[PDB]
Paper text:
[name] ([name]) was the first virus particle infecting a hyperthermophilic Euryarchaeota ([name] strain GE23) that has been isolated and characterized. The 18 kb dsDNA genome of [name] contains 25 predicted genes, most of them of unknown function. We present here the X-ray crystal structure of a putative ORFan protein [name], to our knowledge the first for a euryarchaeal viral protein. The fold of [name] is a four-α-helical bundle analogous to those found in some eukaryotic adhesion proteins such as focal adhesion kinase, suggesting that [name] is involved in protein-protein interactions.
We purified the C-terminal His-tagged protein from a genetic construct deleted for the 14 first residues because sequence analysis predicted an unstructured conformation for this N-terminal region. [name] contains four amphipathic helices that are organized as a helical bundle. The three N-terminal helices form a parallel up and down configuration while the C-terminal helix is shorter and packs with an angle of about 45° against helices 1 and 3. The core of the 3 helices is very hydrophobic consisting mainly of branched aliphatic amino acids. The connection between helices 3 and 4 is a longer stretch, resulting in a less tight packing of helix 4 compared to the other helices. The A and B monomers in the asymmetrical unit form a two-fold symmetrical dimer and the symmetry axis runs perpendicular to the direction of the long helices. Dimerisation buries 1278 Å2 per monomer corresponding to 17% of the solvent accessible surface area. The interface is more hydrophilic than the core of the helical bundle and is stabilized by 9 hydrogen bonds, mainly between side chain and side or main chain atoms.
Author numbering:
A (entry chain A): 2 to 119
B (entry chain B): 1 to 119
């Protein structure tokens, strides 16, 4: 797998998803608790994001080859996992706040978010 | 000369990845508190402009994924794009200052690598 691209795409999706939620909340006037929960999620993203910055440089440094150590690979995989839990909590938050009411889950929102990243 | 939310996200993401790339290099080579603080001024600039342009992520969606903007909205975005392009050149300057690149050939190879991570 391409380690750096993978983590970057996941962080970018999650940041764009937070921007989306923030905007929906401003336009609809969400509860104080709702804006707190979103803020808590953004902080969880910034924390995990820094844990992987090493790979953004590391990958470039070793001739753009994806030749990582066992320990490095595992830490990237564990970060990828935390990021996927964040995605889950984002979608759950979207649904809880009234986003995607008359929509088949968050399918359209998700497709729109994916479009912004590629 | 933009296309809405996609342009802004792609610009903010490149800037955020370049900062990640700078913090990444500094960890390996070792950095001072002063060396780290100038990277942090850049990160704070990206976070400032990002929050002023975030409304457009939900707004473009709320109108059939069409970049359809009001007068205030369009002017506000024209401003934000100018600041973002300034931060981009500041980061390039930073790449040379910290010794990550020597000349225009090095800054291009790093940007090409950052584009590749984002696209």
């Amino acid at each position: 797998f391409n380690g750096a691209q993978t983590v970057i795409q996941k962080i970018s999706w999650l940041r764009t998803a937070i921007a989306f939620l923030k905007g929906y909340m401003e336009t609809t006037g969400a509860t104080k608790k709702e804006l707190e929960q979103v803020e808590k999620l953004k902080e969880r993203v910034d924390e995990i994001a820094t844990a992987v910055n090493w790979d953004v440089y590391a990958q470039y440094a070793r001739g753009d080859f994806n030749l990582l150590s066992d320990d490095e690979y595992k830490e990237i995989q564990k970060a990828l996992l935390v990021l996927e839990d964040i995605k889950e909590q984002i979608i759950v938050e979207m649904l809880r706040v009234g986003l995607a009411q008359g929509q088949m889950g968050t399918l359209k929102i998700s497709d729109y978010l994916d479009s912004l990243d590629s």
